[PDB]
Amino acid sequence: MKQKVHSVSYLAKAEFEYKNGVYDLVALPTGAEVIKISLEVVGLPTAGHVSVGFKDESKKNYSSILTLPVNETSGVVTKDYTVKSDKIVAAEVKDALAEGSDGRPVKCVLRALYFLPSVIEVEY
Amino acid sequence: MKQKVHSVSYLAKAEFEYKNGVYDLVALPTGAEVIKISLEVVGLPTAGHVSVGFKDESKKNYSSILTLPVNETSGVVTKDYTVKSDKIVAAEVKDALAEGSDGRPVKCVLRALYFLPSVIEVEY
Amino acid sequence: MKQKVHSVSYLAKAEFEYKNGVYDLVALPTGAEVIKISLEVVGLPTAGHVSVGFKDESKKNYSSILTLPVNETSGVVTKDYTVKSDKIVAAEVKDALAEGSDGRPVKCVLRALYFLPSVIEVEY
Amino acid sequence: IDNCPVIDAGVWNKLNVGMPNSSISDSDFTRYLNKANVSNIVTPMQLK
């Protein structure tokens, strides 16, 4: 029994304030082993969607991987990802107005747990 | 592309024996990045609930975040947490009698995967 | 507040080509803290199941823990595991023919995030 | 040619260095640009 495993893991946490726009949340290296993406809505939104996905450092390669309507206020991507030139995790809010029902601004927190491309050899 | 990430991660595993009471399972530092809480029931319970949640080191600030009835015997919190003075993960069992249907005592295992508040700067 | 935690974590990624057989994907040490098992299907299968589970290094102790039909193409185990002599994560495909609807062979990727049995003492 | 040495510098591949071409991905090319020295980014695919 012998294998190569990723021994280095990072967590990136980034906040944005949940109104229309595009935000570049997490930067990933080539060969990164993205194993968890979680999005959370802190507050009480009244209308809008948040779409998180992957895009290039420069060019317009955005593609949503997780969509969150107002109601559930939390989500996790159902899929695991190896970074292949799509080195930006990004989130866009197309519909959103002011906070709503609270008076206090609505937050969105994205946490990305990913393993670095480096590998080491271990036998058990 | 440059960011700060959490590079240190710990897993805490703690067992309790699934009968009425309150148990202080996992201790977390301020600023800890709790990214997974999982609860497991080893055995065949007959009646009761397990509620895991957060509470203070001293004062009575308990609030359940995951409730487990008898049937499913396993659960994971659907939400991610940054530790803000609620530095105890705790579990309470309000209803439970002896093991039931087995003759062998019923176990509960809680695993908490969390990232330390420390950050480092990386560019990709 | 003082405890012992697992401070060492590895990720093992292994690919197989999604046709009938048994594959030994990930090797785990005794006392390993398996906290995530994820299976992914890259391509468009037409018929078949993938069952991942645990088995011995030698003897025929296979037992499925996650079954994936054709449609959903992704899955994650709902349960957390401490390795007790079942030191092989294995995957079997009982039904599968050629790629189907694509012309390009169908891949399956398994990622196992597990914490090493070593512990260290920390107080917060 | 016209007093100007013509040099075959090779092809930029994933292994050794040569002149680029439109097969190099935008990320792979841009990794070698300082972004603090360049005025603008035009990659070989963008030029194509």
Side-chain angles (χ1 to χ4, degrees), chain A residues 9-13 25-29 36 38 40 57 74 76 87-88 111 113-114 116, chain B residues 1-8 33-35 78-82 84 113 115 120 122 124:
Chain A
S9 165
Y10 291 160
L11 184 77
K13 180 178 99 80
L25 281 285
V26 182
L28 308 157
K36 184 161 161 69
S38 80
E40 182 191 295
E57 199 276 330
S74 175
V76 153
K87 300 181 34 177
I88 300 300
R111 299 171 179 88
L113 160 71
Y114 65 90
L116 276 298
Chain B
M1 290 186 353
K2 172 176 45 171
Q3 215 172 47
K4 305 206 206 287
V5 290
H6 305 291
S7 65
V8 179
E33 256 338 327
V34 164
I35 60 171
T78 59
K79 184 149 191 36
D80 287 283
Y81 289 161
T82 280
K84 297 204 234 259
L113 160 71
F115 265 83
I120 60 167
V122 294
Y124 301 163

Coordinates of all heavy atoms in Angstrom, one line a residue, chain A residues 9-13 25-29 36 38 40 57 74 76 87-88 111 113-114 116, chain B residues 1-8 33-35 78-82 84 113 115 120 122 124:
Chain A
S9 N -3.1 22.2 2.9 CA -4.5 22.6 2.7 C -4.6 24.0 3.2 O -4.1 24.3 4.3 CB -5.4 21.6 3.4 OG -6.7 22.2 3.5
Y10 N -5.4 24.8 2.5 CA -5.7 26.2 2.9 C -7.2 26.4 2.9 O -8.0 25.7 2.2 CB -5.0 27.2 2.0 CG -3.5 27.2 2.0 CD1 -2.8 27.8 1.0 CD2 -2.9 26.8 3.1 CE1 -1.5 27.8 1.0 CE2 -1.5 26.8 3.2 CZ -0.8 27.4 2.1 OH 0.6 27.4 2.2
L11 N -7.6 27.4 3.7 CA -9.0 27.9 3.7 C -9.0 29.4 3.5 O -8.3 30.1 4.2 CB -9.7 27.6 5.1 CG -11.1 28.0 5.1 CD1 -12.0 27.0 4.4 CD2 -11.6 28.1 6.5
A12 N -9.7 29.8 2.5 CA -9.9 31.2 2.2 C -11.3 31.7 2.5 O -12.2 31.0 2.1 CB -9.5 31.5 0.7
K13 N -11.4 32.7 3.3 CA -12.7 33.3 3.7 C -12.8 34.7 3.2 O -11.8 35.5 3.4 CB -12.9 33.2 5.2 CG -14.2 33.8 5.7 CD -14.3 33.7 7.2 CE -14.0 35.0 7.9 NZ -15.1 35.9 7.8
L25 N -13.6 36.4 -5.2 CA -13.5 36.0 -3.8 C -12.2 35.3 -3.5 O -11.5 35.7 -2.6 CB -14.7 35.1 -3.5 CG -16.1 35.7 -3.2 CD1 -16.2 36.3 -1.8 CD2 -16.6 36.6 -4.3
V26 N -11.9 34.2 -4.2 CA -10.8 33.3 -3.8 C -10.0 33.1 -5.0 O -10.5 32.9 -6.2 CB -11.3 31.9 -3.3 CG1 -10.2 31.1 -2.9 CG2 -12.3 32.2 -2.1
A27 N -8.6 33.2 -4.8 CA -7.7 32.9 -5.9 C -7.1 31.5 -5.6 O -6.8 31.1 -4.5 CB -6.5 33.9 -5.9
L28 N -7.0 30.7 -6.7 CA -6.5 29.3 -6.6 C -5.4 29.1 -7.5 O -5.3 29.6 -8.6 CB -7.7 28.3 -6.9 CG -9.0 28.5 -6.2 CD1 -10.1 27.9 -7.0 CD2 -8.9 27.9 -4.8
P29 N -4.4 28.2 -7.1 CA -3.3 27.9 -8.0 C -3.7 26.8 -9.0 O -4.7 26.1 -8.8 CB -2.2 27.4 -7.1 CG -3.0 26.8 -6.0 CD -4.3 27.6 -5.8
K36 N -14.0 22.0 -0.9 CA -15.2 22.5 -0.3 C -15.4 24.0 -0.7 O -14.5 24.8 -0.5 CB -15.2 22.3 1.2 CG -16.5 22.8 1.9 CD -16.6 22.2 3.2 CE -17.6 22.9 4.1 NZ -19.0 22.7 3.5
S38 N -18.3 26.9 0.3 CA -19.5 27.1 1.0 C -19.8 28.6 1.0 O -19.0 29.5 1.2 CB -19.4 26.7 2.5 OG -18.7 27.6 3.2
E40 N -22.6 31.6 2.5 CA -23.5 31.9 3.6 C -24.0 33.3 3.5 O -23.3 34.2 3.1 CB -22.8 31.7 4.9 CG -23.6 32.0 6.1 CD -22.8 32.0 7.4 OE1 -22.2 31.0 7.7 OE2 -22.8 33.1 8.0
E57 N -8.4 34.7 -14.5 CA -7.8 35.9 -13.9 C -8.1 37.1 -14.7 O -8.3 38.2 -14.2 CB -6.3 35.7 -13.8 CG -5.6 36.6 -12.8 CD -5.3 38.0 -13.4 OE1 -5.1 38.1 -14.6 OE2 -5.3 39.0 -12.7
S74 N -28.1 29.6 2.6 CA -26.8 28.9 2.8 C -26.7 27.8 1.7 O -27.7 27.2 1.3 CB -26.7 28.3 4.2 OG -25.5 27.5 4.3
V76 N -23.7 24.9 -0.4 CA -22.4 24.2 -0.6 C -22.4 23.6 -1.9 O -23.4 23.0 -2.3 CB -22.2 23.2 0.6 CG1 -21.2 22.1 0.1 CG2 -21.6 23.9 1.8
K87 N -8.8 30.1 -12.3 CA -8.1 30.3 -11.1 C -8.8 31.4 -10.2 O -8.2 31.9 -9.3 CB -6.7 30.7 -11.4 CG -5.9 29.6 -12.1 CD -4.5 29.9 -12.4 CE -3.9 30.8 -11.3 NZ -2.5 31.0 -11.5
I88 N -10.0 31.8 -10.5 CA -10.8 32.7 -9.7 C -12.1 32.1 -9.4 O -12.9 31.7 -10.2 CB -11.1 34.0 -10.5 CG1 -9.8 34.7 -10.8 CG2 -11.9 35.0 -9.6 CD1 -8.9 35.1 -9.7
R111 N -16.4 30.6 2.0 CA -15.3 29.9 2.5 C -14.9 28.8 1.5 O -15.8 28.0 1.0 CB -15.6 29.2 3.8 CG -15.9 30.3 4.9 CD -16.4 29.5 6.2 NE -16.7 30.5 7.3 CZ -17.9 31.1 7.4 NH1 -18.8 30.8 6.6 NH2 -18.1 31.9 8.4
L113 N -12.2 25.7 1.0 CA -11.2 24.8 1.5 C -10.6 24.0 0.3 O -11.3 23.3 -0.4 CB -11.8 23.8 2.5 CG -11.0 22.5 2.7 CD1 -9.8 22.9 3.5 CD2 -11.9 21.6 3.5
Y114 N -9.3 24.2 0.1 CA -8.7 23.6 -1.1 C -7.3 23.1 -0.7 O -6.6 23.6 0.1 CB -8.6 24.6 -2.3 CG -7.7 25.8 -2.0 CD1 -6.3 25.7 -2.3 CD2 -8.2 26.9 -1.5 CE1 -5.5 26.8 -2.1 CE2 -7.4 28.0 -1.2 CZ -6.1 28.0 -1.5 OH -5.3 29.0 -1.3
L116 N -3.4 22.1 -1.9 CA -2.4 22.6 -2.8 C -1.9 21.5 -3.7 O -2.0 20.3 -3.4 CB -1.2 23.1 -2.0 CG -1.3 24.6 -1.5 CD1 -1.4 25.5 -2.7 CD2 -2.4 24.7 -0.6
Chain B
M1 N -3.3 38.1 -8.6 CA -4.0 37.2 -7.7 C -3.2 37.0 -6.4 O -2.2 36.4 -6.4 CB -4.3 35.9 -8.3 CG -5.3 35.9 -9.4 SD -5.7 34.3 -10.1 CE -4.5 33.3 -9.2
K2 N -3.7 37.6 -5.3 CA -3.0 37.5 -4.0 C -4.0 37.6 -2.9 O -5.0 38.3 -3.0 CB -2.0 38.6 -3.9 CG -1.3 38.7 -2.5 CD -0.2 39.7 -2.5 CE -0.6 41.0 -3.2 NZ 0.4 42.1 -3.0
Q3 N -3.8 36.9 -1.8 CA -4.8 36.7 -0.8 C -4.1 36.3 0.5 O -2.9 36.0 0.5 CB -5.9 35.7 -1.2 CG -7.3 36.0 -0.7 CD -8.3 35.1 -1.3 OE1 -8.1 33.9 -1.4 NE2 -9.4 35.6 -1.8
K4 N -4.9 36.2 1.6 CA -4.5 35.6 2.8 C -5.4 34.4 3.2 O -6.7 34.5 3.1 CB -4.5 36.6 4.0 CG -3.7 37.8 3.8 CD -3.2 38.4 5.1 CE -3.0 39.9 5.0 NZ -1.7 40.2 4.2
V5 N -4.8 33.3 3.6 CA -5.5 32.1 3.8 C -5.1 31.5 5.1 O -4.1 31.8 5.7 CB -5.2 31.1 2.7 CG1 -5.8 31.5 1.4 CG2 -3.7 30.9 2.5
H6 N -6.0 30.7 5.7 CA -5.7 29.9 6.9 C -5.0 28.6 6.5 O -5.5 27.8 5.7 CB -7.0 29.6 7.6 CG -7.8 30.8 7.9 ND1 -7.4 31.7 8.9 CD2 -9.0 31.1 7.5 CE1 -8.4 32.6 8.9 NE2 -9.4 32.3 8.1
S7 N -3.8 28.5 7.0 CA -2.9 27.4 6.7 C -2.8 26.3 7.7 O -2.1 25.3 7.5 CB -1.5 27.9 6.4 OG -0.9 28.4 7.5
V8 N -3.5 26.4 8.9 CA -3.4 25.5 10.0 C -4.8 25.0 10.3 O -5.7 25.7 10.4 CB -2.8 26.1 11.2 CG1 -2.7 25.2 12.3 CG2 -1.4 26.6 10.9
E33 N -11.9 28.9 12.4 CA -12.7 28.8 11.2 C -13.3 27.4 11.2 O -12.8 26.4 10.6 CB -11.9 29.0 10.0 CG -12.0 30.4 9.3 CD -13.4 31.1 9.6 OE1 -14.4 30.5 9.7 OE2 -13.3 32.4 9.7
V34 N -14.5 27.2 11.9 CA -15.1 25.9 12.0 C -15.7 25.6 10.6 O -16.7 26.3 10.2 CB -16.1 25.9 13.1 CG1 -17.0 24.7 12.9 CG2 -15.5 25.8 14.4
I35 N -15.2 24.6 9.9 CA -15.7 24.2 8.6 C -16.4 22.9 8.5 O -17.0 22.6 7.5 CB -14.6 24.3 7.6 CG1 -13.5 23.3 7.9 CG2 -14.0 25.7 7.5 CD1 -12.4 23.2 6.8
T78 N -25.1 22.1 8.6 CA -25.3 22.7 7.3 C -24.7 24.0 7.1 O -24.9 24.7 6.0 CB -26.8 22.7 6.9 OG1 -27.4 23.6 7.8 CG2 -27.4 21.4 6.9
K79 N -23.9 24.5 8.1 CA -23.6 25.9 8.1 C -22.1 26.0 8.6 O -21.6 25.1 9.3 CB -24.5 26.6 9.1 CG -24.4 28.1 9.3 CD -25.8 28.6 9.6 CE -25.9 30.1 9.5 NZ -25.0 30.6 8.4
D80 N -21.5 27.1 8.3 CA -20.1 27.3 8.6 C -20.0 28.5 9.6 O -20.7 29.4 9.5 CB -19.2 27.5 7.4 CG -19.0 26.3 6.6 OD1 -18.2 25.4 7.0 OD2 -19.6 26.1 5.6
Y81 N -19.0 28.4 10.5 CA -19.0 29.2 11.7 C -17.6 29.8 11.9 O -16.6 29.1 11.7 CB -19.4 28.3 12.9 CG -20.8 28.0 12.9 CD1 -21.3 26.9 13.6 CD2 -21.8 28.8 12.2 CE1 -22.7 26.6 13.6 CE2 -23.1 28.5 12.3 CZ -23.5 27.4 13.0 OH -24.9 27.1 13.0
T82 N -17.6 31.1 12.3 CA -16.4 31.7 12.8 C -16.6 31.9 14.3 O -17.6 32.5 14.7 CB -16.1 33.0 12.1 OG1 -15.5 32.8 10.8 CG2 -15.2 33.9 12.9
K84 N -16.8 33.3 17.7 CA -16.9 34.6 18.2 C -17.4 34.4 19.7 O -18.6 34.5 19.9 CB -17.8 35.5 17.4 CG -17.3 35.8 16.0 CD -17.9 37.1 15.5 CE -18.6 36.9 14.2 NZ -17.8 37.2 13.0
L113 N -13.8 19.7 12.5 CA -12.7 20.1 11.7 C -12.8 21.6 11.6 O -13.7 22.2 11.1 CB -12.8 19.5 10.3 CG -12.0 20.2 9.2 CD1 -10.5 20.0 9.4 CD2 -12.4 19.7 7.8
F115 N -10.3 25.5 11.2 CA -9.0 26.1 10.8 C -8.7 27.2 11.8 O -9.5 27.9 12.3 CB -9.2 26.7 9.4 CG -8.6 25.8 8.3 CD1 -9.4 24.8 7.8 CD2 -7.4 26.0 7.8 CE1 -9.0 24.0 6.8 CE2 -6.9 25.2 6.8 CZ -7.7 24.2 6.3
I120 N -1.8 33.5 6.4 CA -0.6 33.7 5.7 C -0.9 34.3 4.3 O -2.0 34.1 3.8 CB 0.3 32.5 5.5 CG1 -0.4 31.4 4.8 CG2 0.8 32.0 6.9 CD1 0.5 30.3 4.4
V122 N -0.4 34.5 0.3 CA 0.0 33.7 -0.9 C -0.5 34.4 -2.2 O -1.7 34.9 -2.2 CB -0.5 32.3 -0.8 CG1 0.1 31.6 0.4 CG2 -2.0 32.3 -0.6
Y124 N -0.8 33.5 -6.4 CA -0.8 32.4 -7.4 C -0.6 32.9 -8.8 O -1.2 33.9 -9.2 CB -2.1 31.6 -7.2 CG -2.3 31.1 -5.8 CD1 -3.6 30.6 -5.4 CD2 -1.2 30.8 -5.0 CE1 -3.8 30.1 -4.2 CE2 -1.4 30.3 -3.7 CZ -2.7 29.9 -3.3 OH -2.9 29.4 -2.1

